[PDB]
Amino acid sequence: KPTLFSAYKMGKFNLSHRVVLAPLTRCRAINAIPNEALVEYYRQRSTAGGFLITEGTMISPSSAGFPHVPGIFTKEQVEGWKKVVDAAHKEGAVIFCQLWHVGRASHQVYQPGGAAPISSTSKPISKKWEILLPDATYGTYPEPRPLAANEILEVVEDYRVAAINAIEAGFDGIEIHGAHGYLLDQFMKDGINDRTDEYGGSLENRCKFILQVVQAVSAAIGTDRVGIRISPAIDHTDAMDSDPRSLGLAVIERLNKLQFKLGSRLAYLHVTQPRYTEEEVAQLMKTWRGAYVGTFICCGGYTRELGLQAVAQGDADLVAFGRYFVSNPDLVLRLKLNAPLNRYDRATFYTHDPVVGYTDYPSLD
Ligand SMILES: NC(=O)C1=CN([C@@H]2O[C@H](COP(=O)(O)OP(=O)(O)OC[C@H]3O[C@@H](n4cnc5c(N)ncnc54)[C@H](OP(=O)(O)O)[C@@H]3O)[C@@H](O)[C@H]2O)CCC1
Ligand SMILES: Cc1cc2nc3c(=O)[nH]c(=O)nc-3n(C[C@H](O)[C@H](O)[C@H](O)COP(=O)(O)O)c2cc1C
């Protein structure tokens, strides 16, 4: 009988419990190289048969939209990741690298040559949102440059290469970051995508880019090593869709069709709970899970009780935790014990110290 703490076969991989480390950007990978701080951070959070998803990891120089986030497009970066992955595996973890391109959610200071960030559109994120800059001030999101069709294929290739590099580093698989208003979401969401070509308009056209990515990374490393993350019901950085239910089902129908065509299942579908800044929200997530053929990871506001309930009721197979994992390196143990959870200090979510607010939250002895 499925519970939050029971084993699960995630296709190729065996898990011993259903508690997942959600992907969390933390900005400790100085100059984009995974380092000793990241090794300790993921090692602290590793459990035997526990699934870990890394922080968003750059697939290219133009991918950058936060300071000191890791990449996986150079040999130096891959060598850094090897040390992280080896340590996690020594603890018996299964670990996926999240492949991340921010699209228009960037700034000239992050872009090679100070070029404009790339996107589906020329429309910037509106001024009511600001971007954290490398000098600890907040700046304005600039006007992005809309990709030409040939250029989109180049980014698909960047994803493909990043997936190969992740496997070279020893990762068990990768997660495609298709959520939270970043590049792939800038194509999916009709509040952003104003294109009139083959990548704009219909749900078919809007889902084209992310499906090309899923197809490319699956070709590179296998369907069973690929997860995909989406967030159809949000408004973060103006990433709204007029019909989140249908958008989510459109992605899911295409994932299902691809699985049927290729003859195998993706590792999982990962969806974050609707959020704009409640029971319809609950039902939406159940509708999406019900439609997807395969493993479903839920995330967003889950607690010990909500997580137990999600797995017991069949609403999800795995439950991811973000903010609680920041402050509770041994979150799985704490959940198993119903121990109090350490409060997290949001002030150090995105600072760059390898210890302070990163690896110095205590575990239980
Ligand atoms: N994909 C990526 O690379 C990352 C996407 N992330 C997502 O972007 C959005 C904005 O992130 P943020 O860190 O700038 O702000 P946020 O997490 O939304 O928190 C802002 C305020 O909302 C509050 N809030 C009340 N409900 C909640 C709730 N369900 N969840 C996240 N906060 C909440 C939250 O309370 P806490 O400090 O977490 O207790 C805080 O007061 C979030 O949806 C986040 O999940 C952040 C950065 C990079
Ligand atoms: C500091 C911080 C960094 C995050 N980084 C990522 C990220 O790199 N990729 C991603 O898909 N989501 C990211 N998220 C969203 C989280 O994965 C997660 O969905 C969110 O924290 C909600 O789950 P929770 O209620 O358990 O915190 C981040 C969230 C926070 C607070």
CATH-derived topology: TIM Barrel
Rg on CA atoms, Å: 19 Å
Which sequence of strands runs across the widest sheet?
3-4-6-11-12-13-14-15
Largest sheet: 8 strands, parallel, barrel
CATH architecture classification name: Alpha-Beta Barrel
The count of domains is: 1
**Percent range of helical residues:** 25-40%
SSE pattern, N- to C-terminal: EEEHEEHEEEEEHEHHHEHEHEHEHH
- Count of alpha/pi helices: 11
Percentage beta strand: 15-25%
CATH superfamily: Aldolase class I
Bound ligands? ligand 5J8, flavin mononucleotide
Through-space gap between termini: 30 Å
- Number of E-state strands: 15
The oligomerization state is: monomer
Shape: globular
Structural class: alpha/beta
- At the first level of CATH, what is the class? Alpha Beta
Function: Involved in the biosynthesis of the antimalarial endoperoxide artemisinin. Catalyzes the double bond reduction of artemisinic aldehyde to produce (11R)-dihydroartemisinic aldehyde. Also able to reduce 2-cyclohexen-1-one into cyclohexanone to a lesser extent.
Binding site for substrate: 177-180, 275, 350
Main location: cytoplasm
Family: Belongs to the NADH:flavin oxidoreductase/NADH oxidase family.
Topology:
Blueprint lengths: L7 E3 L2 E3 L3 E3 L14 H10 L5 E3 L3 E2 L16 H16 L3 E7 L17 E2 L10 E3 L5 E3 L4 E2 L2 H21 L3 E6 L4 H6 L14 H4 L1 H14 L4 E5 L13 H19 L5 E5 L6 H13 L4 E4 L4 H9 L5 E4 L1 H5 L3 H7 L28
Parallel strand pairs: 3-4, 3-15, 4-6, 5-6, 6-11, 7-10, 11-12, 12-13, 13-14, 14-15
Antiparallel strand pairs: 1-2, 8-9
Helix pairs in contact: 1-2, 2-3, 3-6, 7-8
The structure holds ligand 5J8 and flavin mononucleotide (FMN).
PDB class: oxidoreductase
Keywords: Dbr2, oxidoreductase
Assembly: monomeric
